[PDB]
Amino acid sequence: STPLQGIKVLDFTGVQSGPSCTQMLAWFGADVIKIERPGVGDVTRHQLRDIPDIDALYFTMLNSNKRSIELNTKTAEGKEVMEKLIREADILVENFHPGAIDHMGFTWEHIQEINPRLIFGSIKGFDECSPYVNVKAYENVAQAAGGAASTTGFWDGPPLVSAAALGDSNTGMHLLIGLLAALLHREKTGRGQRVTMSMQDAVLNLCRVKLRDQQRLDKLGYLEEYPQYPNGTFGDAVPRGGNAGGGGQPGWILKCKGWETDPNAYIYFTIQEQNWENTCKAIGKPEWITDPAYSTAHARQPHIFDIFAEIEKYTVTIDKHEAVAYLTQFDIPCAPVLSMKEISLDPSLRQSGSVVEVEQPLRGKYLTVGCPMKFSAFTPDIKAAPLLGEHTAAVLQELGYSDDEIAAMKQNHAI
């Protein structure tokens, strides 16, 4: 068995935020029916194709295990099919522009009358209360609005976006949490409900530690662990701190052998408070162990970049992998800056099911990120992503439509 065996999901989504959520639902055992505009489909099918004329990787990596129907929900037949789908489903997920699903006639209020058990999940750029409620959002728009761009990068550079999908997949994972909680809640109430997740809120959740810092800054006028302390200055808002420890212990990105020509010849190195003695032994600085300028985090902070420079005198001499193999013998929290090339080929990531090779029709093999959490009682089976409208007939037949009704829908461009 699987966690969501028997659950039916209507995936009325596109791009990344909504589809990441429903892909996980499929991997958990749900029947996910992706509802797509006839002849067009999810925009990711056509975006940044590496092979002409077939679905792009953007699509296949976000839509594994789903079924695809082509349905124009703006036609009379399409609206009726949508209603029948809603009546039979457990979950409906959508991430179209603000107002879009409403204008089709499928407001939450209507969805509720059709099926009081249905859970309706909606992703938008911003909350209902926001002055930006009607604003379209992509990944980095949310990173700017949610606090991440403000606090990422260097103090003497611009705000910087993260490569990680803070606005997209992150929001999808947050919606997923809400959908699973709503399924658990429905076990008690017998009713569905609406779950909304904004991209701004998803980014803010991950920036909780910077809201901690803002409050410390408001109270004290300084942030004792930030690069700016004590020889720099603070303004009224949490500043960018380069490669500082953030929510972790103090640390930095350090150069390893090759850094001049290899943009990934680096490690992250943590000075863990309770590990100062082992840290000193690792770098051959026994004299620093009890020296009062070095023996506490507070005393190190005003010359911490001298300390990092000293560690770097060692790390630039060996490959990042060697540097880590050595330093971890001293219980130092560190790791190489792994490139996507190293990740894509890493045997341990294949073994754990974190990077998964999947065979797609026409394309053949591709890699995707697998189900990130591991369960002792079940293993997701990750499959190909659907061809556009591959399952239209089957889905309509499951709803009880006859061959004549389906032929009429095709003639009327409802499918």
Place this chain on the structure above:
Amino acid sequence: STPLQGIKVLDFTGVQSGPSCTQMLAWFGADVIKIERPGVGDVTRHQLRDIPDIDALYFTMLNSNKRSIELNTKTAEGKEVMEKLIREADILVENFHPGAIDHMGFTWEHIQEINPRLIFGSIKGFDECSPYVNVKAYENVAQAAGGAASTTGFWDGPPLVSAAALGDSNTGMHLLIGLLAALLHREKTGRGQRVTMSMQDAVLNLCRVKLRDQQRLDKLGYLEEYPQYPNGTFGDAVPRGGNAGGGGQPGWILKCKGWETDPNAYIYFTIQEQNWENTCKAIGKPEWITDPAYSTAHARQPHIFDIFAEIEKYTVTIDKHEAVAYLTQFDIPCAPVLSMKEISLDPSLRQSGSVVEVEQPLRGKYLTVGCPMKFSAFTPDIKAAPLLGEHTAAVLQELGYSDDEIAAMKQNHAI
């Protein structure tokens, strides 16, 4: 009613990854018992205190609504209390260093025998088959190992960490998804199971789009939307792309009025493919609408920074908020780079329950990030974080211990 009403959780966690997960469980209605080392407690209680002698904000913003017991699980009594707790609980969550819980005698195999219905959630830096399985991890160590640091920042600068908790809270949210799925699964099987989540995998999941790019790069030798195309060069790994669109449409961080003195006087600006005409009207370049050098994404790419420079001629003249109010009239996806100060005071974020003022004993008011997703059938009630061992006696009494038994535990330093 609440989603997790009646669920009992043992929170054997510290710092940020584990505690973020169990805080959400508490907000969903679970009884979350935080198990803490006597006389010490979670390290976040004393990290970066802004008020002398009381719990730090790092702790209060991650431990709302929880109960706290002091229990030394290395003593004979403490082991027996832990066993009774496990027998009565639904979920046990831990994020101690690799091996730590095992060495106390609470391996998964033993947990299972005590209570076959219990779901055991475990966070570690790396997966079981990783060469780094025993390595300690903080936030940025995971960002380095998971692909984010490699691909974040500028092409001519170092790898850069994100301010967002990609390794910590993100991992907690991923574990939470697994725990909720396991509760749903247990409805079918009648059994608990083990759910494990590594910080490296959590980061990788959010970097799914960069694994897409790595495969495109492997096939083609170039990435047509990256800043390096077509006038720069590509190596064998996905490079850093500065403030480029990433998973979203092409875009950049643009200066607004005040940028020379205000590190947050900026917006993110998206050139949405289907919006080129409105974009041109917005900036007073009607001549660019059908000009073949400008009218498609492909034609714009080779001189896209000249286009951003031209937009910046407008944005530097107005404050970021005014820039956005104007540009959104043209259906342009954009938003200001909001500072943590702006976020902390934003009335709409108070109204949506995204930033929540909570009253803590002794401290008084503080702000926290609320429950990020919104539910139509219930509203989380966010409360204070527990004082160390505040609930020890109540928890032991609930387990059936007499006053003499509790007194003996105190004498024997079990509590």
